[PDB]
Amino acid sequence: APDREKALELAMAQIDKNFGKGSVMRLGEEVRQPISVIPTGSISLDVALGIGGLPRGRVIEIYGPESSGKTTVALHAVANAQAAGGIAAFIDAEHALDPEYAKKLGVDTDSLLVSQPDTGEQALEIADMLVRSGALDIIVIDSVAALVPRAEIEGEMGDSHVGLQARLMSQALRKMTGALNNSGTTAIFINNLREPETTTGGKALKFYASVRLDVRRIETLKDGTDAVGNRTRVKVVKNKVSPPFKQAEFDILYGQGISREGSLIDMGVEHGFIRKSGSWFTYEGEQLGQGKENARKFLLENTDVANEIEKKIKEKLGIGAV
Ligand SMILES: Nc1ncnc2c1ncn2[C@@H]1O[C@H](COP(=O)(O)OP(=O)(O)O)[C@@H](O)[C@H]1O
């Protein structure tokens, strides 16, 4: 009488109809809902997400230690959203943002809303007010930790020293998500997890997110033996719109953003478009140079190649039709 796959498809169906598409899913599954998305600025991370980038109208949490490449992504995400003619807001609570570096990643700074809240309540509340005007495509809150409650800010005693900063973050997200879905704004929270919850407030963010990225630093790019950039490693630990747990890597050169050419090489090799004699890179017969850097340089100067490689890697995977 029983047929496990039949009874299982049925189960899953009911499950998703009760809690939302993606509440349960086979990892090897290949999602075909192309969503609305905001390119991460990293082809690999975009593919890692399985949907081409950050989903729209969702709470995204990008965590990791200082200098791991988080902000940069966050910024690239803002740049891509703006080229699509979208409006961006930046709830700054750290006062670190280097707009000069931002423009370099393609961000139109003169049109970027910025706010520098006095208290945690304020910060979130200002983000909420903006979000629910449906004008914004993306909003970035720098530093989950920085959202300290007002009571703590103003001199207030070690009396009523409850876990209020996390309750703060729960109530705020309880109501913002609603707006975020209707508005379609993607909200990236930047949780610098460094130095019981991930920064006190990220405990409630662990559940409200639709996507959580574990940004980490893994190597220092040198080519020979000198300071150039660093290779980041992102892990999609949570993904409610596609099979989670995938991993993507990329290079961020000092003063520049996520290296396109760099990626192209990586993405290329793992897909046999570009062959890597051991320590020499080549493409369709053409020699790119020894050392990932000479090739990087090669592809930067020979804009024609790279562009056809991007084509091939894209053709094979996505950013296409549906
Ligand atoms: N203001 C800046 N000027 C030059 N390079 C920067 C700047 N900000 C970030 N970078 C580059 O981006 C890399 C990652 O930094 P970032 O992602 O901003 O730190 P975090 O992980 O705290 O967000 C840095 O190692 C550097 O290569």
List, in order of start, the domains of the chain with CATH numbers.
25-258 (3.40.50.300), 259-318 (3.30.250.10)
Distance from residue 67's CA to the centre of ligand 1 (Å): 6
CB 212 within 8 Å of CB 187: no
DSSP state of 210: S
Distance CA 265, CA 259 (A): 10
Distance CA 15, CA 24 (A): 7
Residue with the smallest CA separation from ligand 1 atom 26 is 254
- For ligand 1, pick from 75, 97, 101 the residue to mutate: most ligand atoms within 8 Å of CB: 101
Distances (CA, A) of 17 to 11, 23, 179, 308: 10, 9, 21, 42
Distance CA 152, CA 2 (A): 59
Distance from residue 259's CA to the centre of ligand 1 (Å): 13
Distance CA 303, CA 300 (A): 6
Classified as helix, coil or strand, 61 is strand
Q: How was this structure determined?
A: X-ray
- For ligand 1, pick from 90, 100, 142, 254 the residue to mutate: most ligand atoms within 8 Å of CB: 254
| Ligand 1 pocket, residue 66 CB under 6 Å | yes
Burial class (CB in 10 A: 0-12, 13-18, 19+), 150: middle
What single string gives the DSSP state of each residue in 213-265? EEEEEEEEE-TTTS--EEEEEEEEEEETTS----EEEEEEETTS-B-HHHHHH
CB 144 within 8 Å of CB 205: yes
Distance CA 107, CA 97 (A): 12
| Ligand 1 pocket, residue 158 CB under 6 Å | no
The atom number, within ligand 1, closest to the CA of 98 reads 1
Residue with the smallest CA separation from ligand 1 atom 13 is 69
For residue 251, which phi and psi values (nearest 5 degrees)? -110, 140
Residue with the smallest CA separation from ligand 1 atom 5 is 255
| Ligand 1 pocket, residue 103 CB under 6 Å | no
Distance from residue 43's CA to the centre of ligand 1 (Å): 19
| Ligand 1 pocket, residue 67 CB under 6 Å | yes
